[PDB]
Design a protein around this ligand. Structure first.
Ligand SMILES: Nc1ncnc2c1ncn2[C@@H]1O[C@H](COP(=O)(O)OP(=O)(O)OP(O)(O)=S)[C@@H](O)[C@H]1O
Ligand SMILES: Nc1ncnc2c1ncn2[C@@H]1O[C@H](COP(=O)(O)OP(=O)(O)OP(O)(O)=S)[C@@H](O)[C@H]1O
Ligand SMILES: [Mg+2]
Ligand SMILES: [Mg+2]
Ligand SMILES: [Mg+2]
Ligand SMILES: [Mg+2]
Ligand SMILES: [Mg+2]
Ligand SMILES: [Mg+2]
Lengths: 898, 898
């Protein structure tokens, strides 16, 4: 067979609904080294004086009004990737109609009924047009809902603009897509860079450029270029590129690039190609579409040739065969995937879960392994008990004052320790310290040395450096200690005693943060990491973060569902073990990052397979563990809300980030939780499994019933001198069945199907179709025999009655078999469908019954049915339902439902 | 007027649905001193030898089988109060039909249509029968649901019985109602006494008889009488009465009394009278019923006299006037109160809230003040951090071992301290201590000395007494301390230093529990409270109970709703203040129980009005505060789950107890929470306010529309030579309107109405009826004019058309005005009714508009309506709706909706 390139009937969904966003910010290291044309304009803008910058981008210090921003947007464009542009509705309607199947339907109908048979081909075009509008309406509604949901959780940028429209200006929050070139914004810690910026002013701005330059260390950014030599576009100290984050400090800069014009837009190579590889969901959809196309190509030509050879009317035979094959078209596949999931997403929106792109739900339904960090999930972020002790254990006010100095002047990410220190310190001493001391510089949290430091001064002759951080990192650089109120050198015995005391504190669940203070003479030169040496240790603050009340029940529910919960923390092993024991999560053996840093990939994969608590991990360690976990059929999902957690989020099959997080974590994630709760995640997982099961059920039903009808009519034409149904009748049946199925996304789901992770095998759909098709065909042949013999529809002159008869049964069959195939169990007693499904089933059955007796039946070439047909119809329906219910067991035993 | 005794048409609901349970266990001190006949049988049973007890009650040590327990139940009766017996369904149907209004309806119809007018009086009886069956069905369904809900949370008793039916026996759990006389059960701490018991065996059984004997101190209970002199039935040491609780110890006893035969059944005086005083809900229902009866007595006789004088047919006039007055009958009042609330209760069942009796919902909707205890609600019961230090502060293993000895052997109620001590202690030392030491006696928690004590021994020569409790109570009795590993006398300076250290610990949120140990020579004599003296203090265990994560948001929501949250704790003031500060609840000034023990009632009432945190309270203090809080229009609800919290629960307007609590707290409470969560309580409060608003709306609509029709027909008969409607048509209209209103309990409620506590004023119903009645009357007179002039229904020979005309619009008015009166806002845009209400409205409108064209119309004396009447009825309906919407503003401004 093969010839996949020849087949082009598949219509793929837009790249926004499925597949991850093509702009993670980092992606991968480029090899083309960008185009040189851009990295001359970048350098020029870096060195271009600020005074003439206003005229270049037509920007004023006050800001931009509505007209100016609109003109800039129209001129330059939108701050979005090209793949993120929604199609116009008329384009969407046209592409939803120009598909080969509907065009061929209309052309063949016109050809068959061109000569002296008007109103026979006009209505057959009307029916396919109604089907096309129905599909377009469903797709448009679902896409609009999904796009609205995605934009609900989007990164915001603070821009001056004009509020009063008279020049009053202010500060707003808008999604990054609306940032036009030549716009003035301000930046703070935790806010990602929305677009390429020219730094206008900066106070201690430190940003993380590891996405682009590959260096984990933060890089300074000054208002004016302090670096000596330019000609390195990425390393210029006055420009910040999109996709980077502000580690610390404050700044105000002007937008200079937007959309593809940004460095990441085209220089990173994202715009060029970068569309060769699809994901698992797209591959499964493509497999299903190819299966349906193969089925149609195998079946429909046989019917066409048989009818044409038997009756001699090749055109009518082709039209009828195409009408039969309509039910198996892949054009339905978008709708389902677009509609069902979207509905589930809406329900997730009511459960404090926002899904960015729909396909993640599949992974979100098969997340057997869940890697999370303890604080925020396992324990409350707010700390209840904190005491500022000294080496001897006595309470020290000096340690608390130094902690306040280091936590009130720092401009980095806000920490639970910083908030607790600010709250605990009394107001009077707070004012005294604020008046006495003033900031001179800042050394941000590099995350390698794990030591945040701040330099302050109260006089122009001496500077005091105060640093906090993990106990071991502080101790590695301290030289002196204030034990007993004297500056005694820190000996090995004192270090061992401190380690014993801190281990005792940790085993109780108290984390330890040390504070060190150093005095230096007045120095104009800016301080760097090298100055953090020979520090005088002051004390260690012991604090407790209580485990959340919901943590234990949520973890129990998660492990009952089958989601193996693993912890990848970057704190002390003892604290993590105590937290896991208190929350009831078994820890087994802890594994430090130093060990895994040397093991082989296979050894680490096996260890992660047989481990639950990983402590003292670098972000590279977390990414490596997440990547190596997905080595044998395991779909691992990571949950992080840090600066460096974006690579880990992208590495995992599904990334989850809390709404109250840094902007990069939200942007790179796939699912956004409105709060950091495990119970919310568990409920969302249940709902997502329900939604995926509903979509699979929809596809299976609509494929199986149509294949059964195709088989029915396939073995019918040899012994019939007329068409068993007219193509118009088949189109009516398909439209009414689709109207009935509209409510399937709202169907209930059996608890058996959502008790385990779902592994979707597209190949199972073919076996399901083959098993559940001929059951309808047997009773369709029975209906043919009933019409031919009992009711004497033996001649073409009385053909129409024949057709009408089968029509009714067919429709009702397609409308009733649903209620006996949406289970592994016995319907209506052991399980029931949702009310909307019942309502639609009743409505469609009533319409199908009334259609032969409707006045339009003569227009639709339908003849009224005699009353003797009704008991036979009921008997056939009951027999079909009973037969399928009894035969479901064989399919359950042979292969299984899930 | 007066003559309230003469009026007896009001039907009261059964005493189980409304009003508290008449068996709190304690009630009040009796003055009749019981009947002497019972307190001779009680003494005889106390002194009657155990060997012959088996034959007296026909009980075997192995237990009782199904036949024997059934025979005993049939002979003696059921373990329930007489007021708790549900009525038989046939009795319920008969009492729901023998009401005077329906009987007079049938009698007057028969009298009017006795002579040559059959099939006219038979059908008028059929309609009232159908209405009676509808009312009975609704009442029966709602009562069954409420009774099922009440029995869900009921006290259980562990009884041997027979499981295998072959004599294997075992231990079961059955609601106390099934405990027949001569049944063998076992008792544990926290289980209330289900019925009068004869103690067969007892290990250190201590029970609280303060309900009966009024003594707070626990009383011993031995298998054989150890007291010297009998003839005091309450103080006999071998019998336990119903309504008492087991403070500590274990026992196995035999049931000797059941139902009213128990001491509390009739000797307490509960059976005799004790039904004079109703509650607020019953008084409001009675006021509404009296209002409706007075309105009927004012209106209907006038119509009867006018029609009888004008037309001369007194019997038909009386029939018609009674049919008009049907809509204002109080017979609907049970249904509503029985149905609506029940529906809400069902929803509360899905929100982990179980309502025992329906009336509490009203109080549960007006609970402006909520008194609760901190632990369990404010903070999690489980404690995260605990360290067993000594006086010098060093960690002491001896203190932990003594705590394990005192917490593993005690049989009292489990404490979080006991659980934490048991878990913290290592298994090896646990086994060593268990093997080394053994119990000799026990001194339970009297709650006055606040010191639980246990005496153990490792040799037959020395006994060690170990006691824990609050720090101050332990220190008040200690004499020596093990400071620095020596037995040094406890001086004042050491006491002051310990107090300073413990206050420092408390200010951080850590509670302090001290442990004292004493040595005694081997003494056979049983130990008492007097032996707790000259104890050697060992150490104080410091533990932390973290505040719940949901506490702060739930408290914020509660205070936003208007529920003032007050705390009545019995712990240290500093700990309560720290907890309140951490959870965000403002504390202001703490108040100790010693101060309030001396203040006057008015002073204490004012203080409680202007205070939030009460610490160091006795249960009497809590009861006094709760009682004095309800001194000015305040509905105060208490939440407790302790032994002594039952009087406080009964004192409050509404009592709330958690499902996981002692049996007495659950039994005496009014609402049972499936978990100790404030968010659940807040959601339940919102739902209960919704339910009460729905019931009030139902009553207001069904009264106002009927009064409007009554007024309409009242000023209509003078200028009409025929009845404006037939009584049969009126009955049909009322039945269809009731069918429409069936779904009102499912109506949505505006958030404005449930944003504040509800104060139900029955007198407002009359003003609402007077304001919203004549609007319907104006358009009814318009309909009369339309029929008389435009359609020329000027003679009795063409009377029926007239009637039929009005019929239609009449019904539609009563069916449509609903949608424009269930608001203070504009309908269908600013607020909408629930879908079931819309469905019922549409169905009833269709039925009413189709009845004149139905074949039964001739049977119902109804004539088909000309098509010209349809635009007129549509215009009349639109005008009536618009007029009501416009004039709603005047009613809202003059009085107000809520
Ligand atoms: N700018 C900073 N970036 C990262 N960590 C910081 C920073 N400043 C201080 N820290 C500390 O370093 C720890 C590293 O934790 P992360 O794993 O990066 O994030 P997290 O949410 O705190 O999860 P944990 O700490 O591993 S339980 C933080 O918990 C802080 O105590
Ligand atoms: N048998 C007992 N009955 C009552 N309290 C006891 C008993 N044994 C020990 N206690 C202690 O006495 C305290 C009195 O608290 P209660 O108010 O009666 O109940 P509670 O649920 O603990 O609410 P608290 O303690 O006031 S926050 C308990 O918290 C225990 O620490
Ligand atoms: Mg931001
Ligand atoms: Mg600097
Ligand atoms: Mg069919
Ligand atoms: Mg019990
Ligand atoms: Mg004893
Ligand atoms: Mg009316």
């Amino acid at each position: 067979m093969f010839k996949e390139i020849f087949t082009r009937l598949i219509r793929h969904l837009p790249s926004r609904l499925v597949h991850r966003d093509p702009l993670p910010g980092a992606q991968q290291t480029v090899n083309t080294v960008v185009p040189p044309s851009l990295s001359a304009h970048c350098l020029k803008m870096a060195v271009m004086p600020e005074e003439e910058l206003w005229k270049t981008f037509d920007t004023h210090p006050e800001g931009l009004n509505q007209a100016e921003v609109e003109s800039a947007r129209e001129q330059h464009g939108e701050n979005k990737l090209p793949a993120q542009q929604p199609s116009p509705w008329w384009v969407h309607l046209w592409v939803c109609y120009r598909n080969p199947f509907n065009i061929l339907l209309t052309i063949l109908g016109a050809i068959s009924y061109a000569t002296e048979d008007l109103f026979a081909a006009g209505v057959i075009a009307l029916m396919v047009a109604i089907s096309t509008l129905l599909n377009f309406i469903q797709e448009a509604r679902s896409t609009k809902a999904a796009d609205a949901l995605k934009a609900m959780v989007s990164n915001t940028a603070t821009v001056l603009r004009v509020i009063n429209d008279k020049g009053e200006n202010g500060w707003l929050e808008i999604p990054i897509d609306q940032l036009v070139p030549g716009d003035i914004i301000k930046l703070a810690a935790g806010d990602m860079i929305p677009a390429d910026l020219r730094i206008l002013q900066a106070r201690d701005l430190f940003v993380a450029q590891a996405s682009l330059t590959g260096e984990s260390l933060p890089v300074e950014k000054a208002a004016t270029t302090r670096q000596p030599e330019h000609s390195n576009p990425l390393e210029c100290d006055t420009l910040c590129f999109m996709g980077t984050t502000v580690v610390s400090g404050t700044a105000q800069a002007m937008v200079i690039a937007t959309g593809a014009n940004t460095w990441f837009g085209q220089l990173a190579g994202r715009v060029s190609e970068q569309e060769s590889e699809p994901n698992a969901f797209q591959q499964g959809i493509s497999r299903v579409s190819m299966l349906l196309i193969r089925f149609m190509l195998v079946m429909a030509p046989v019917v066409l040739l048989i009818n044409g050879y038997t009756k001699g009317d090749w055109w009518e035979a082709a039209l009828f065969a195409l009408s039969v094959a309509v039910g198996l078209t892949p054009e339905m596949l978008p709708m389902i995937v677009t509609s069902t999931l979207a509905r589930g997403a809406v329900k997730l929106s009511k459960q404090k879960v926002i899904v960015k792109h729909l396909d993640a739900i599949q992974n979100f339904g098969a997340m057997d392994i869940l890697c999370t960090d303890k604080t925020g999930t396992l324990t409350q972020d707010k700390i209840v008990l904190e005491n500022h002790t000294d080496i001897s254990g006595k309470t020290s006010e000096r340690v608390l004052h130094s902690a306040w100095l280091n936590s009130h002047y720092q401009t980095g990410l806000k920490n639970l320790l910083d908030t607790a220190v600010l709250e605990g310190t009394d107001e009077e001493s707070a004012r005294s310290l604020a008046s006495r001391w003033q900031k001179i510089d800042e050394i941000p949290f590099d995350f390698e040395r794990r030591r945040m430091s701040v330099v302050v001064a109260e006089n122009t002759e001496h500077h005091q450096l105060v640093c906090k951080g993990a106990l071991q990192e502080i101790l590695n650089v301290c030289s002196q200690v204030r034990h007993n109120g004297e500056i005694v050198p820190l000996d090995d015995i004192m270090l061992r005693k401190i380690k014993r005391v801190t281990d005792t504190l940790n085993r109780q669940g108290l984390r330890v943060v040390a504070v060190a203070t150093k005095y230096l003479p007045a120095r104009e030169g800016d301080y760097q990491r090298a100055d953090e040496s020979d520090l005088i240790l002051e004390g260690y603050i012991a604090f407790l973060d209580p485990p959340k009340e919901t943590t234990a029940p949520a973890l129990k529910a998660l492990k009952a569902s089958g989601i193996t919960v693993k912890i990848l923390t970057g704190d002390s092993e003892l604290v993590a073990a105590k937290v896991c024991h208190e929350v009831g999560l078994d820890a087994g053996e802890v594994v430090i990052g130093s060990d895994i840093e040397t093991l082989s990939d296979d050894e680490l994969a096996n260890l992660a397979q047989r481990t639950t608590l990983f402590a003292r991990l670098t972000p590279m360690h977390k990414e490596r563990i997440v990547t190596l976990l997905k080595r044998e059929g395991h779909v691992v999902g990571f949950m992080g809300d840090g600066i460096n957690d974006a690579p880990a989020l992208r590495a995992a099959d599904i990334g989850i980030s809390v709404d109250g997080a840094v902007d990069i974590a939200r942007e790179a994630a796939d699912i956004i939780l409105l709060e950091k709760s495990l119970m919310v995640l568990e409920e969302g997982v249940i709902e997502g499994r329900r939604t995926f099961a509903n979509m699979l059920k929809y596809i299976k039903m609509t494929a199986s019933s149509n294949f059964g009808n195709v088989f029915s009519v396939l073995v019918a034409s040899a012994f019939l001198p007329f068409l068993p149904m007219l193509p118009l009748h088949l189109l009516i049946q398909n439209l009414l069945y689709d109207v009935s199925q509209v409510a399937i996304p709202f169907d209930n789901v059996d608890d058996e199907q959502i008790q385990k992770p779902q592994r979707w095998n597209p190949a199972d759909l073919g076996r399901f179709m083959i098993f559940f098709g001929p059951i309808s065909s047997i009773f369709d042949i029975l209906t043919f025999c009933l019409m031919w013999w009992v009711f004497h529809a033996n001649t073409p002159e009385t053909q129409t009655l024949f057709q009408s008869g089968w029509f009714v049964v067919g429709l009702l069959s397609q409308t009733l078999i649903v209620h006996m195939i949406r289970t592994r169990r016995v319907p209506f007693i052991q399980s029931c469908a949702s009310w909307p499904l019942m309502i639609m089933t009743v409505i469609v059955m009533i319409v199908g019954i009334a259609l032969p007796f409707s006045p339009l039946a003569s227009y639709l070439q339908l003849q009224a049915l005699p009353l003797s047909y009704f008991p036979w119809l009921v008997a056939i329906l009951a027999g079909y339902m009973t037969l399928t219910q009894l035969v479901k067991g064989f399919y359950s035993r042979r292969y299984g439902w899930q």
